[PDB]
Structure 1
């Protein structure tokens, strides 16, 4: 079955990369979400967040206007209340801004991590009405304006990290210059990457900015890129990129990949998703009004 092949592939990736994982957590995730994994925008992700360690995260999105993942995760005990502003945040999001899609991702050593809210691209101001948003978000209006972060294309709630991400369509001509990324990173005292990487960042269509409830400042920023096949992933930049590009499983032979470049206070690491069914990459390009 497709669900058995997905579960097998996930475990095979975990073992090949030495990623920590729990069979009981996988069993729980799949009891709730496995059928969805067969039918929707499913992806397997590895990242080198931890030093000398790879983490594996599985995720899916689907074009439903209600947050089905919240209901499933509540039902299966994957999401219980934690006495924290995250408890209602996704609900407020779906109440504040109409959604065209939703999604969810799961750490295979832990359980549900984030739930996603996907509107049509919308002015960032529509986010400011959300009651349980951390104060830092509205505190960063001038930052958003300055860096041309006006076109909001997604929102996520991270229940494990107790944080929230705003995602923007990087449509502005300034965002096609390496100087933009140098500046925005330097504005948070984040380490500026190599020139090679900067030249990759100029094509990033999506910029994620992380906020939380313990600090006034930006926790992290991530710049996402897509690649149509294994070959065009920059495999020379990092061993995890090469190995995953070359060896990630998918239902088609040459899947696309999504690469995120995350930067924080001196975290600064790489994330890579395989487009397991071949739907995610076209949807990424479409959502950012780019051609394949």
Structure 2
């Protein structure tokens, strides 16, 4: 369709507009193999802040259709976009699929580097201890007391990062403290991560999504992320966005006049690497309303 070539053009436009490194060759190979799954599924375009003056650009899709579940991994492997290094990360997706009933999956793409991440969403929420049999990083188990103590133990999804050999764990915000700003202040303090502004803390009371990143090199929790949805460009708190990301919320491409957004705040060791902002445009306009 034209829908697919529209999507490839919008992304090169973003990558160029916002100074994001990219590889036309790489984009081609991804779209050759995955283009239709973009036009036919929940689809989002991301820019992040990991480097002060230039955004990176990503694009991702979410497969909710029962019959298609598992084809993302198959497609990824058969075409060579995801090849096996025997890495500690490389066995996780098969293990997850045998252990847990799966209700959604998705692929994340880096406009320069190609296929970056694969998500698995469990059917329903599970005690995180049920994931302890998997070849996750040792740092997951060794923080089991910390996961329970901060009510980060209702596990619903895995994100497997192949560029960084790291794993994201996703947590439902079941506990009354998750609607409290003091919980996010105390969580960032306990992790010795960079403190949040009061504006962000206020927003986090109606937070609903928490993610934790673990990797095989480090005995420490590498970073965490909070996610909030916003219905449209206007609903976005723009005092939390630097100028480059302000421009992105006004000019991010989508097939609706006023797309919704998912914003992500990554936090890591204070004075260290991983405290930045993520902006996801709801390209089709049907991810955010759900």
Shorter-chain TM range is over 0.9
1:48 is paired with a residue of what secondary structure? strand
Displacement after TM superposition at 1:80 (Å): 0.8
Displacement after TM superposition at 1:40 (Å): 0.1
**Match among 269, 273, 282 for residue 275 of structure 1:** 282
Q: Please provide the CA RMSD for this pair.
A: 1.2
Relative distance call for 1:52 and 1:241 in structure 2 (3 A) is closer
Determine the C-alpha separation between the residues in 1 that align with 2:139 and 2:57: 29
Matches within 5 A, 1:1-292: 1-65=2-66, 66-123=69-126, 124-130=128-134, 132-238=135-241, 239-265=243-269, 266=271, 267-283=274-290
Contact 1:99 1:117 in 2 (8 A): yes
Determine the C-alpha separation between the residues in 2 that align with 1:273 and 1:96: 30
Displacement after TM superposition at 1:194 (Å): 1.0
Of stretches 193-202 and 220-229 in structure 1, the one that deviates more from structure 2 is: 193-202
1:84 is paired with a residue of what secondary structure? coil
Contact 1:45 1:274 in 2 (8 A): yes
Size of the aligned set, in residue pairs, is 282
Residues 102-137 of structure 1: CA deviation (Å, up to 9, x unaligned):
00100001011000001123222221222x111111
Of stretches 143-152 and 265-274 in structure 1, the one that deviates more from structure 2 is: 143-152
Contact 1:167 1:207 in 2 (8 A): yes
Contact 1:234 1:241 in 2 (8 A): no
Determine the C-alpha separation between the residues in 2 that align with 1:121 and 1:192: 32
Displacement after TM superposition at 1:230 (Å): 0.7
Contact 1:97 1:126 in 2 (8 A): no
Displacement after TM superposition at 1:6 (Å): 0.6
Displacement after TM superposition at 1:86 (Å): 1.0
Determine the C-alpha separation between the residues in 2 that align with 1:27 and 1:111: 10
2:92 is paired with a residue of what secondary structure? helix
Displacement after TM superposition at 1:22 (Å): 0.5
Query: 4+ residue stretches of structure 1 with deviation over 4 A?
Result: none
* Structure 2 gaps, min length 5: none
Alignment-derived partner of residue 288 in structure 1: none
Displacement after TM superposition at 1:240 (Å): 3.5
* Structure 1 gaps, min length 5: 284-292
